RNA sequence: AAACCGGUUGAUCCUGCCGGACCCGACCGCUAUCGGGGUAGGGCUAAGCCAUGCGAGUCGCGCGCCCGGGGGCGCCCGGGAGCGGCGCACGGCUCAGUAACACGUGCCUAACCUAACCUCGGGAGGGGGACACCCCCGGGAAACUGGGGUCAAUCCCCCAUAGGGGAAGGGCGCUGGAAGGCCCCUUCCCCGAAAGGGCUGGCGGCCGAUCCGCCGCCAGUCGCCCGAGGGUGGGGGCACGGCCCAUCAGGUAGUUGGCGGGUUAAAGGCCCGCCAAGCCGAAGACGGGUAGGGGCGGUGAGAGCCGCGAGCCCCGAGAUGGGCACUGAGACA
């Protein structure tokens, strides 16, 4: 598979022009292809590590990258929303946040804050013996009991240990709760959910964010809930 | 096959024909159309059978009734020129599923669903009368 | 299988009863039919395992002997014996010819049974008492 | 189908009509004067010229509120270029602009303004082989169009 | 620069056509010093015919064998012919076919499949077999290819369990706008997994220099199988939008629809059996002509006109013409 630079996703911070006329393909992992970026492509235009493919596949595959707790030796691994990535050899802690400007930005986040990770519930079915599995934003998984599963709706937000494969935390969708948008023009911006649409399909409704009295709007498939009136996790 | 009612059953209710057959009223999703006021037990009909439609409704006139469960409608829209600064009535007719509940006649205005490919040239379903309509409005909440 | 002979592919012939050109010349292997795997009423049960599509399997009935007839007056499943084929509604050739097809009426030694499977795709004949 | 090529731009300064002699005659004199080298540079100076007018002309179209977050910056733009003596100008004079303010930007032109050379084409004989000195860098370009902060950078060799 | 000029009269005002002046594209003539930037160049012409060369490999950390150097513990290094895995369905070309769900925009699949990768949960037990390279012989002009012997596997197969599918009945529960779906219970029939394999280090034991291995455990690591979701690719459906001609007015008979089936991964006259007469058309059917569609490009002050709609990107189709299949997740390559 090849990926042509006219068809790379326009909010990836490459050069238009300039260059050759690919651009590397993310690897079919844990995100969208429109909504990632390949992990050599944060290795050589996002950190500047590397100058060439090759250097960053070099770093790459000696595991000095560590996405999410797990070391990834793939230069074409998908880097996407809310992801944690580590560098071993200098111990600097990214996460992958929602940006005004870059669209996406790996903003440095603490060492304790380093082993959380937000996910928003993205479905739940029901699997054998009667188990509930929630998919969330980025195709990740959990089985639960089904009374756990049960109070756990679409569109909540669950804060989960990676290292212990627990749910550390749940933020239940709530008018008036704290939310980021993750997608869509309106990007980046963190305000109160104040205001809803409900219209007759669920993902779409109409969404109202409040930062004071900068208000904008979106849909409801578009915001994540990052918490009560402050984010429980460094996303700024 | 179809049978009447004197009153119009609501979305969930169970009628047995005169064979003995029970046919609930399923709910299709659809909260500003009424069901039918009669219960047929076709299995490709949306209100008492399997069938699935989307959310991509229509309203159009009946031209042709005389195939079975079937009829020719009528789709009229507007279409801007650029070039006269005006506009164009344009239509186009349309073959649509009929179910045996829902009688339709020449000149009715009704609505259509998108489903499944049934035919040839079928892809889309009576799914009421423009009488069945009812009003329907979004839920607005605020903070104050 | 996925076979040009029984291609299911779109017609050439538009609503209006008029021809109309091709669009592809050569017919996609996607789009390609197989031949009827219907069982032949026989003496012994044979399967055969096939591969599909994304390779999946499906088991086809070549030769069916016994049936799975349920009497839900007893609410219970017995592996009766087919006698023979008494009427194929579909087609009449399919019973002439001694084969089973899904709504077919088929004299097991429970008695009279109507085939409520696809013979064909499931590659069993359960069928139900009259 | 297409495919973008670039396309000349002088042809906003080049007339239709070549054949007038009072046109003719304007051409001549400006040409002498400044010592170009051919039409198509006092033509390249006039594409910039009604470049300059025209984009006057579409902000006095637009509303005030639109024009207010460009005017400034305009007029400020063309000061520093200094193809405009004064940037608090109203937005209407810049529309009377001529395209000898264009040709007085000119390296060449700035060479023989400063007394730097004998003539204006020994100051474009000086700038093509590569006697003068911008700031310390040799430009060897007559037709560059230097700004305002760069005209007291220039030197001989 | 939102421009006019020459021409019909003996002269005059009109109409109205033709020419001039500008830009762009193709070919052509005369002439031609340098540099930079750019996705220019058998498209506009035969999808006409071709000599010659090159244009998809990689992996010894899947596997046995052979050869050479080194060394004693259990091998180290290098090479060879192969088996085996993965890839070759991407990438490159061109514009015949196509007026079409081809293409574009906006939506679907609750009617579907998907190797590689991600995540969550679970599993990896017993047994068997063959074919290369190779050795001994060849056959054939070459292409290619035969017999015997013999060592392996992450090669091939059986067994068990897990799991899966079909039919039927029931249900709190899940998703979702809506269950023909998921989960749970019940019954029968049917199909039916896996490589604990490689490496590293440690431990123990069997074994022998005619060996440099085999076995049992542990940790790390790359792997294998099942269930669910995602990801990616793909199949299919829908509404609308974009050519000329009436010196083309009636067209259609599997044609239009229904019912029951077969096939498919999956809906569908996709195909089949029966039933009805339906379907399209002057809001232009049908017929003919032209053409790959779009982003886009040239020109004009603009509305607009044109396609130089060749080159660059996206989708489509094709590989001398016409057909049909194997393998495989995917081709009718
Ligand atoms: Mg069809
Ligand atoms: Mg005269
Ligand atoms: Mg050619
Ligand atoms: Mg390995
Ligand atoms: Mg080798
Ligand atoms: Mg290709
Ligand atoms: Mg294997
Ligand atoms: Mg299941
Ligand atoms: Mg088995
Ligand atoms: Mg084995
Ligand atoms: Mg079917
Ligand atoms: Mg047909
Ligand atoms: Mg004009
Ligand atoms: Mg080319
Ligand atoms: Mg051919
Ligand atoms: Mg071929
Ligand atoms: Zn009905």
Avoid at chain 1, 131 to 158: A, M, S, W
Avoid at chain 1, 160 to 172: F, G, Q, S, V
Avoid at chain 2, 78 to 85: A, D, E, G, T
Avoid at chain 3, 25 to 46: M, S
Wanted: glycine residues 8%; charged residues 30%; positive net charge.
């Amino acid at each position: 598979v090849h990926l042509r630079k006219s068809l790379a996703p326009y909010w990836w911070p490459i050069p238009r022009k300039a260059g050759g006329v690919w651009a590397v393909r993310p690897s079919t992992g844990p995100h969208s292809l429109e909504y990632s970026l390949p992990l050599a492509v944060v290795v050589r235009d996002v950190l500047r590590y590397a100058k060439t493919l090759r250097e960053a596949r070099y770093i790459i595959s000696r595991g000095y990258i560590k996405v999410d707790g797990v070391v990834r030796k793939d230069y074409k691994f998908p880097i996407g929303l809310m992801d944690v990535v580590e560098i071993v050899p200098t111990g600097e802690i990214y996460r992958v946040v929602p940006d005004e400007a870059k669209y996406y930005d790996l903003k440095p986040i603490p060492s304790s804050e380093a082993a959380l990770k937000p996910l928003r519930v993205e479905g739940k079915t029901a699997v054998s013996g009667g188990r509930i599995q929630l998919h969330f934003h980025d195709g990740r998984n959990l089985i639960l009991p089904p009374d756990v599963g049960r109070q756990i709706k679409t569109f909540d937000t669950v804060v989960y240990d990676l290292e212990n494969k627990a749910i550390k935390t749940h933020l239940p969708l709530r008018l008036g709760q704290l939310a980021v948008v993750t997608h869509g023009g309106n990007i980046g911006f963190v305000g109160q959910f104040f205001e809803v649409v409900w219209t007759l399909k669920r993902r779409q409704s109409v969404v109202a964010l409040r930062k004071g009295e900068e208000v904008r709007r979106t849909i409801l498939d578009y915001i994540m809930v990052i918490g009560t009136e402050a984010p429980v996790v460094k996303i700024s | 096959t179809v049978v009447k009612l004197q009153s119009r059953p609501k979305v969930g209710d169970v009628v047995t024909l005169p064979d003995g057959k029970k046919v609930e009223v399923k709910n299709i999703g659809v909260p500003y159309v009424l069901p039918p006021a009669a219960v047929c037990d076709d299995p490709l009909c949306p209100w008492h059978g399997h069938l699935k439609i989307r959310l991509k409704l229509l309203e159009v006139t009946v031209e042709k009734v005389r195939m079975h469960k079937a009829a020719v409608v009528t789709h009229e829209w507007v279409h801007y020129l650029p070039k006269y600064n005006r506009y164009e009535r344009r239509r186009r007719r349309m073959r649509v599923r009929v179910p045996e509940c829902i009688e339709v006649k020449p000149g009715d205005k009704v609505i259509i669903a998108e489903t499944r490919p049934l035919s040839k040239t079928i892809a889309w379903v009576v799914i009421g009368k423009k009488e069945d309509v009812v009003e329907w409005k979004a839920k607005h909440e605020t903070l104050p | 299988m996925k076979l040009g002979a029984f291609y299911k592919g779109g017609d050439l012939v538009k609503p209006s009863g008029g021809k109309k050109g091709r669009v592809r010349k050569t017919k996609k292997k996607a789009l390609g039919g197989g031949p009827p795997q219907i069982p032949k009423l026989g003496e012994e049960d044979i399967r055969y395992v096939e591969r599909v599509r994304g390779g999946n399997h499906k088991v086809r009935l070549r030769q069916a002997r016994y049936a799975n007839v349920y009497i839900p007056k007893e609410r219970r499943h017995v592996k009766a014996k087919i006698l023979s084929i008494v009427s194929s509604p579909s087609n009449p050739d399919y019973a002439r010819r001694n084969y089973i097809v899904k709504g077919a009426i088929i004299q097991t030694e429970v008695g009279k049974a109507v085939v409520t499977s696809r013979p064909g795709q499931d590659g069993v004949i359960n069928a139900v008492l009259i | 189908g297409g495919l973008k090529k670039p396309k000349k731009k002088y042809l906003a300064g080049k007339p239709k009509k070549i054949w007038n002699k009072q046109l003719l005659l304007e051409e001549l004199q400006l040409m002498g004067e400044y010592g170009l080298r051919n039409k198509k540079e006092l033509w390249l100076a006039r594409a910039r010229l009604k470049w300059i007018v025209r984009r006057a002309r579409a902000l006095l179209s637009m509303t005030a509120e639109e024009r207010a977050p460009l005017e400034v910056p305009f007029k400020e733009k063309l000061y520093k270029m200094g193809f405009i003596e004064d940037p608090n100008v109203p937005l209407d004079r810049i529309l009377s602009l001529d395209v000898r303010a264009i040709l007085e930007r000119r390296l060449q032109t700035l060479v023989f303004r400063m007394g730097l050379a004998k003539s204006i084409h020994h100051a474009r004989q000086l700038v093509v082989h590569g006697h003068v000195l911008v700031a310390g860098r040799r430009v060897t370009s007559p037709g560059f169009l230097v700004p305002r902060e760069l005209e007291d950078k220039i030197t001989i060799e």
